[model samples]
Target: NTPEKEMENLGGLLKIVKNLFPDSEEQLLSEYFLELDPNKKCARQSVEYSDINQWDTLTDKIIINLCNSKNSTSQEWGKVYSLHRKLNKNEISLNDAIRESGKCKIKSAEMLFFSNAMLMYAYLNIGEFGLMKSTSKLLEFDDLPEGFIKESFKSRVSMLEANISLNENSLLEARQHSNRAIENSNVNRICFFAYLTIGNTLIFEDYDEAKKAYIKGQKYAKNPVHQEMLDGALCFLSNIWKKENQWVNYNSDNIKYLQLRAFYYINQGNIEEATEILDELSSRDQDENELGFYYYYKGLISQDKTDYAKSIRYFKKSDDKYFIQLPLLQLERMG
Candidate 1:
């Protein structure tokens, strides 16, 4: 039996062939349905079945049409769909692309996805848990299409909450949300995300638990990037010495590479050379748990300069409970 992932790929290939086929213009430059019956009612692909035997499919080249006009309700929503084609490829980040999606004119169901949906993501990556909660209020998807694809967003919110909670050092909260994601996320990628978050939550508390979480995530991962990240987690566990640590190879972006390089210097060289790292990253976007650690470094710099107010500010910005006390102890001794 073909596995689900391979079946999905087969469906995609069928869509491509159906799009390019000669009979595609069956009704004098029109569209027609495609198939090969596996029988036994209902279906197992992207399409949903309200009635017995009809099917449907749905994409981009959208905002290149609707965004600049009226019907404004669906207009900006259309741009959202149009914008994501580029968003998905890493050509543009969520911030700028959502800005281009611009103001919505209230809103539709089948052809609409509100700006609020993207807002939840915007809050998640930057350590904005408060905003994420407020943003997710509009994330209610009861009116959207019924399928695992739309269903995935339910898990998406939980997965994001888990990360934000982890950043806030609410380990129990993190694990709670992560379990919700693992238990119900319709997509395996999301389940993998849940498993990965659980691994992070238990990283210092339980070795076997963390390792099991990572391996469980790896078990379901077929996407290359996801596989490598799970592998990186295992590598991190296996080797801590830079000379033998293969985790360095998974530095997937320039920002990630720089962040790891800084860790290398901190682990090996002196702080004198490490200050240059601070200079280069001073105005860069090193997000993805980067801001939390970034503030810690800035706090140290401010402390060295004897700028008590600035040092305390940076420490507070770190928002981490574990060593937020790192700078606070200095105050207790003197003030």
Candidate 2:
């Protein structure tokens, strides 16, 4: 057969193979497709020669070509790809991504896995603890493509479970889940969140252990988000050091850092500093959880100033069961 004819045949074969294994890695597909190319180069390589990087660009081209062919499964994949891009670019909120991806009627295992995985990420990112747990139940961990993707999914689910337990004040349960995640995955993002959970749960009762966990978390903190989490962990550690009469300075403009600083100041009877920080934070838009912390800190500052009624009001505004404990205790003491 002529080289041109053979190339056409190879492309047709790839289309059939892709239909069979839609979720297969690009590298795997490249390997099979390249074996048939006359020049031993992938369709992606015809545009770029680099082997290690640019996989996303290559994958984009492949998906676009498939979608252009008007294949039904590829059309579904195109939707998933569009949703993923939207999520990555922050064009759509995580909840919106969840809702849109959930509506996709999946006919293949690949589509099923992709949709559920997207849901898991959305639930985790928004701190929808109960929903995340329920979503995790829908995913079969073993069915996910292997390597980093599968490991990350499993680790993230465990990390979410740990965070949920932490929110419920079940420190022991949280620790167990965090430890499981750390043991199972080496992914930096997974390990960073798992260690953050460990640090958060241990901070109250075991300051030293919490410090260790936070330090480990810092090691894996490569991205901006992970770095922010590490900063928050360090803020907690700074408070611990202060309590031990060994203060450690942690200067940051990050909201989490500022929140912890305000809390630290309130604990040290530096109500003026605490008020300044809380006032600054309150002026900015914050999510419900962050607003809860803001109100909780405001209550503490009010309590310090002997404004019991004001303190109680601020605490009630917090609307956080776990955090409202101190305000309730203060009210009881005042009565």
Candidate 3:
């Protein structure tokens, strides 16, 4: 659950949005604050989705008011504007969006720009197109300054762009971007993602590079926030090893990774390993979001094992975690 202060912050933004465009369509403001409506047909959804998606859409307008309220620069305005267009038109590609943001008329701010870049990376990772593009543009407007952000920003951006290239199946281009990211920054946070992304690209193509990337990402695996990134990197490395018929090294990094590994192992008929890891991860964090997924995966594993009773228990747990109405409507009835 969110703190009271955080709710107030959001409430303040809602008030501003109401005042700014009272005559706007229902979906305009409502779209961003879907959860606040209290009329959602499904009750299992994550609280963050309502605000996060809306904020992603109207980020530019919201930021304008927010910065003005704080007497800050309006630089975020242009990026937001770019994002809105990107989202609406479905042109959420980051590279294109970054290029478009540079074409924005708004004068840029150094500090805010770094954040804009990180947001873009997050969007792409989560499959949020519009948000990613606007952020990319904001970063490309100017070279990062000589500071914590600038040094890290340059490398991180390069790494993301490289990952993009890898997705396009241009290995050479991917490697070039990865190399540049490594050279430009020494920050572990920056390398955490950079290395993970590179490792993913090399998982099936280059064993040596894949190992290096996994090792680099593991250096930050102990941190709570970076646990997800570490888990993903380690998972990729482990898969590669398995494919080559080699055993991968084990480490006590984070529970999140264990959950991920559990999913993978379960799918491969390694129920004992999957169940053991799932039990351990559940014991530690008990994160509602991931735990729901743990149950879902467990149910699938159980179903595979012909354990109908255990499968039902896990399936019920998964259903209780989030409303699946939207997905179900699309899948079952298609209405």
Candidate 4:
């Protein structure tokens, strides 16, 4: 409904979201998000994988060309960089990203450093290890700026580092990064997602600890999309509709909302609905963590298909040690 003025006063999820936008782009951004109406009505679009790749190439053309420019400002790259990061999916090549990054010389725009943080985040979100490594090399995690923005960047860098470690299966290092983010983040986005990542580092180790982390994240979150995801995350603890209040708002276009709903249906013995969601997700690219979730549903669906052995194989693929808790449990449960 209302914009940054209202949300910033509240100092919650929306505040953090507003902060993420470059001040110049807020007008266009507001127009794009203003029509969302999850309560009154909702719609779904099942995009083809081929179409996604086609879209990817289109964005890649612009982004790569900008990178090739010797005179392009960080502001320009920052604008397109955000576009390349579509729903946590970027299929651009690592070699090309590194080469483009090396060629990029913009380091002094107002949002230059901010864009750097986002770049690392996008790399982490997409499971690009080599790319993240280069970004980390350039950013220098131990060194940070001062004052409020320092806290913000530090928390983000820590959270991004957590994923790097998390993806590497270094649970302790990843836990440390999450801890640092929790201790320092001034933004709710970091707090919520930092806590969510904190939950992730523990999922393979202690189920109860992970639940506590998820609960902590929920407190900092006010965005309905994020709230649905946090609530949906606990689907393993109980059915999504275990309580009558649990209903699909379906406001956000983010796939996690739909994925978790499918997960809920799996436990509810509604394979048909769950499979419908799965079929739609079949072509979209996923982040490292998100891919784990994709296979979790696949295994669950296969289990219901009377292919117990097949489910185990699918479960094995899902057990990435990042968020493999349920798949591991299911594996033992079968034995």
RMSD of each: 9.7, 9.0, 17.7, 11.2
Model 1 is weakest, by summed lDDT over 10 consecutive residues, at: 48-57
Of the candidates numbered 3 and 4, which has the greater TM-score value? Answer: 4
Give residue 73's error in model 2 in angstroms.
Answer: 5.3
**Which 10-residue window in model 2 sums to the lowest lDDT?**
45-54
Question: Please, what are the lDDT tens digits per residue for candidate 4 over residues 1-335?
Answer: 46532332222433554567634233343333233221111100001111112233334333443445454452354344534354345456544554555544545432355456656656655545556756776775344445333444566578778877876688889888888877765445667877887777765567778778988988866655467667766654444225332545355545666777777777778899899888887776655456566776777778543333343344344334444445666667777
Pairs of residues at least 3 apart in sequence or in different chains that clash in candidate 4 = none
Candidate 1 off by > 4 Å:
1-78, 85-99, 103-106, 110-114, 141-150, 227-244, 250-253, 270-276, 286-289, 295-335
Regions of candidate 4 where Cα sits further than 4 Å from its true position: 1-104, 109-116, 129-134, 141-151, 204-208, 236-253, 283-291, 304-319, 324-335
TM value for model 4: 0.58
Q: What is the TM-score of each candidate against the true structure?
A: 0.60, 0.63, 0.43, 0.58
lDDT tens readout by residue for model 1, 4-30 = 223433334443544676343222211
lDDT of 3: 0.50
Residue 225 of model 1, lDDT score: 64
* Better structure of 2 and 4 per lDDT: 2
Sorted on TM-score, best first, the list reads: 2, 1, 4, 3
Best by TM-score: 2
Angstrom error of the Cα, residue 110, model 1: value is 6.5
